[PDB]
Structure formats: C-alpha cells, structure tokens
Amino acid sequence: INYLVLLDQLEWQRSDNTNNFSWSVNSWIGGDTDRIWLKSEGERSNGETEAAEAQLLWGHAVGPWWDLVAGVRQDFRPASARTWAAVGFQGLALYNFESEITGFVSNGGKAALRLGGEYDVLLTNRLILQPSYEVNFYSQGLTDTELGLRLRYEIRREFAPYIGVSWNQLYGKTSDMAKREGEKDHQVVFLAGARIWF
Ligand SMILES: CCCCCCCCOCCOCCOCCOCCO
Ligand SMILES: CCCCCCCCCCCC[N+](C)(C)[O-]
C-alpha cells in the first residue's frame, strides 16, 4: 500500500589502518497497522564483504510511533551463516527519532540483544546533527557499543551527504580477544557517506 525506503547510513569508514564501506538500511512496506520491515546492515572491504546481516520482520503497530516486530535475522560471514528468531520493539518518526530493542535466539541456545537509537538535532531545516547509539549483547555478555555523531546536509530531502565520527568500544571477552590480536579494544572511526530515503 505504502512503503518507506530508508538507507539510513551508506558510509565509508576509516580508523586505525582499517577501511571499509558500511551500510545500515531500515525500510518497511504495508498498511497503517501492519507492515513488513526489511533491515540490512553490513561491511565490505577490498571487494570482499567482510560481514552482512539482514532481518525480515512483521511490524504491528502498538501506538502512534511504536511497532512490535517479530521475524528472522540472517547473518553472513565469508565462510559461515547463522539464523536467529527475532522479537522486539521498533519506534520510528522520521526527522525525530528511531529507537529499537530486539532480542535474538538461535539454535545452539545462543541469544543476543541489540539496543539502538538516534535522534535528529536540526541546525537548519537542512543541516542536521544526528547522535546515535548501538549496544550489542551475546550469550552462549556485553560485546560492543557504538556512539555516533553524523552531520548531514539535506541537498534534497532524499539525498543528504554527511560526515561523522563513531566512538566504538569492546567489552569482556571481545575486548580480551581484540587485545590478544595486538589491537586496542576501542576505536574512533571517521565516516563519510549519504543518507537516502524515499
Ligand atoms: C561531527 C562530525 C565529525 C567530523 C569528523 C571528521 C570526519 C573526517 O573524515 C571525513 C572523510 O573521511 C571519512 C572516512 O574516510 C573514508 C574511508 O576511506 C578513505 C580512505 O582515505
Ligand atoms: C518495550 C520497549 C519500551 C519502549 C518505550 C516506549 C516509550 C513510550 C512512549 C513513546 C510512545 C508510546 N506510544 C505513544 C507509541 O504509545
């Protein structure tokens, strides 16, 4: 009936001797009370997609801005794949906020939880500063946090180039493995990209 295509982040990322193209896409299709969400979010470098993740979710409205979502998450790595059942809650109001809390369950008793949010701070009607956060837990369990700041200029409302920074931290076993591989367990990542929706 209607739809929204929101390519929320299409961005090249630069940190310590790393470089990738990353994406975060969060789109939906349907009616006023029920919709199908298509989410996708991933990284590639050197023509090799290092990692990709997709979710297909039924969203049922529970109030003016919030949906209950239930569906499937599919993770891809070059030599492996993993399927999760997903259930959570998703809020979205364009030019205001997005917020999500989703749990995931997979075969081997594996569970995960993701918290995320962003909100728009209008500097002008077209220059918009967007702080964001994402928190990931895994249990077989806090694994990682990303605190972002993206400054976009809406040329068109449909094409908004931006620059930004993300403060990324690892925790616990993920942090210990990072250090064991000779790497810091935190990064400042620099971003250039575009936000596109229609
Ligand atoms: C509030 C905005 C913070 C601005 C931080 C500075 C961003 C500077 O970098 C912008 C251009 O670079 C972005 C990432 O680079 C792409 C990765 O590959 C490039 C290879 O050089
Ligand atoms: C279970 C997740 C909790 C999310 C908290 C939601 C905030 C409640 C108020 C925002 C809007 C609620 N509303 C109006 C959609 O019903």
Author numbering: 90 to 229, 239 to 296
What did the publication describing this PDB structure actually write?
23 While PcoA is a periplasmic multicopper oxidase, distantly related to CueO, PcoB resides in the outer membrane and has an elusive function. Here we structurally and functionally characterize the outer membrane component of the Pco system, PcoB, recovering a 2.0 Å structure, revealing a classical β‐barrel architecture. Aggregated, our findings indicate that PcoB serves to permit Cu import.
In contrast, N‐terminally truncated PcoB, PcoBΔ27−81, a form that does not alter the Cu‐binding properties, successfully yielded crystals in the presence of the detergent C8E4, which diffracted to 2.0 Å. However, the architecture of the PcoB barrel is flattened as a consequence of intra‐barrel contacts between charged amino acids, thus restricting the width, whereas these interactions of OmpLA are caused by hydrophobicity. Strikingly, a 12 × 18 Å wide cavity is present on the extracellular side (top right), as established by condensed loops between strands in the region leaving the aperture uncovered. From this region, a funnel‐like pore is penetrating almost the entire barrel, becoming narrower towards the periplasm, with a remarkably electronegative funnel surface throughout (bottom right). Along the pore, multiple negatively charged‐paired residues are present, in particular: E130‐E223 towards the extracellular side, D97‐E207 and N115‐Q179 towards the periplasm, which are both placed perpendicular to E187. However, the structure was obtained in Cu‐free conditions, and consequently there are no indications of the metal in the pore.
